[PDB]
């Protein structure tokens, strides 16, 4: 409710021999997908990805769709231009990605603006923090840079960022507010594993939480065991919630000297657990 953000993650991928380029626009409010345009569908239209966006009326969707189709055309031209810049064949598949948007403070004021491009997984060109100069990643990127400096693209972006982005984020934040503040606290438990040896594995689980941010630690009498712990990347359950686990290998018989700590924003206080052999 402090810092907030509105970002669009765009993808354009050439598919020579299989059809027209695949084009996608995906918008995020506080890292939450709220809208999506996908050109690989019927008669492609911008669509709500969160029920609170359904409040915006027909006008909104029609204008966002039209813009998306125009953006699609611009990216088709870009793919062609980059084959020229990099002297690449017309037969290979290539990817252009963009991250464009803004982040505001609790006061609604702009904290930071983004406009960054990438070609085949690598940075291409990005609008600096000042919102006036550009950072080119290679020689091809210098061409665009001269072109964009000449046209005053930086000024056009700063104008979108300080106004439209910022103003629309506020709109989005007041329709999605309650929804975006949603919290699902984790349910944790410890499992015990052993393969006939003098060591056991204790695995601390955190299930059903939202949002994804969470911290699991194993402690050996007050000391965090970061160096000897195994842990997975937080993953989606597929039902909207996330999962994660952290394990530790301890000597047989010393299970009760280890504690697992679960830190998550939905908890009144951090969870503390130990291996608990069933009744």
């Amino acid at each position: 409710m402090g810092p907030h953000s509105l970002r669009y993650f765009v993808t354009a991928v050439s598919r020579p021999g299989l059809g027209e380029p695949r084009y996608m626009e995906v918008g995020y409010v506080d890292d939450t997908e709220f809208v999506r345009f996908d050109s690989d569908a019927e008669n492609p239209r911008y669509e709500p990805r969160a029920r609170w966006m359904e409040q915006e009326g027909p006008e909104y969707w029609e204008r966002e769709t039209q813009k998306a189709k125009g953006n699609e055309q611009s990216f088709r031209v870009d793919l062609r231009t980059l084959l020229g810049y990099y002297n690449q064949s017309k037969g290979g598949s290539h990817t252009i990605q963009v991250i464009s948007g803004c982040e505001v403070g609790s006061d609604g004021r702009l904290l930071r603006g983004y406009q960054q491009y990438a070609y085949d997984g690598c940075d291409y060109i990005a609008l600096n923090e000042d919102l006036k100069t550009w950072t080119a990643a290679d020689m091809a990127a210098l061409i665009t840079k001269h072109k964009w400096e000449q046209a005053g693209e930086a000024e056009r972006l700063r104008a979108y960022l300080e106004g439209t982005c910022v103003e629309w984020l506020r709109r989005y934040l007041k329709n999605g507010n309650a929804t975006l503040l949603r919290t699902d606290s984790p349910k944790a438990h410890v499992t015990h594993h052993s393969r006939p040896e003098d060591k056991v594995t204790l695995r601390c689980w955190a299930l059903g939480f939202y949002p994804a941010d969470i911290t699991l630690t194993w402690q050996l009498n007050g000391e965090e065991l970061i160096q000897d712990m195994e842990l997975v990347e937080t993953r989606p359950a597929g039902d909207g919630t996330f999962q994660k686990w952290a394990s530790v290998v301890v000597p047989l018989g010393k299970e009760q000297y280890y504690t697992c700590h679960v830190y998550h924003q939905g908890l009144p206080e951090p969870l503390t657990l130990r291996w608990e052999p069933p009744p």
Binding site: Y8, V10, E25, G27, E64, K67, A68, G70, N71, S74, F75, V77, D78, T81, L82, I96, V98, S100, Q115, Y117, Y124, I125, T144, K147, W148, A151, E153, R156, L157, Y160, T164, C165, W168
Partner: peptide
């Protein structure tokens, strides 16, 4: 609302 993209 997304910005309108120009040419590289």
């Amino acid at each position: 609302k997304v910005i309108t993209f120009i040419d590289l």
